[PDB]
């Protein structure tokens, strides 16, 4: 079973951006990541996956943030940006079409 509880990540900018992208943002509905690029910096920490949903970026609360302003955020955090995550595979599906949550909380997209 996929760990549910919050989580904090230290990812590290560097080079290129994050390696990630998110979805969602629209009437409080939350920030979740949708895709993780391969040996991208959010790859490289091991810790995120795709059905996170980012509670907050270096302290700055993003839960009922937008895509917009989150996506400032990200922007903003520098060089060594500290994420607060919390797997939320069901709350992300909805999200995505044709997805799915399968019995061992893992996302499905037939």
Known sequence: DI???????????????????????????????????????ADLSGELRKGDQILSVNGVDLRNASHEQAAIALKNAGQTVTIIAQ????????????????????????
């Open 87 to 110: 797997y939320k595979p069901e709350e992300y599906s909805r999200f995505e079409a044709n997805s799915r949550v399968n019995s061992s909380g893992r996302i499905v997209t037939n």
């Open 3 to 41: 760990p549910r509880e919050p989580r904090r990540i230290v990812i590290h900018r560097g080079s290129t951006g994050l390696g990630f992208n998110i979805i969602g943002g629209e009437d409080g509905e939350g920030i979740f990541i949708s895709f993780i690029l391969a040996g991208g910096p």
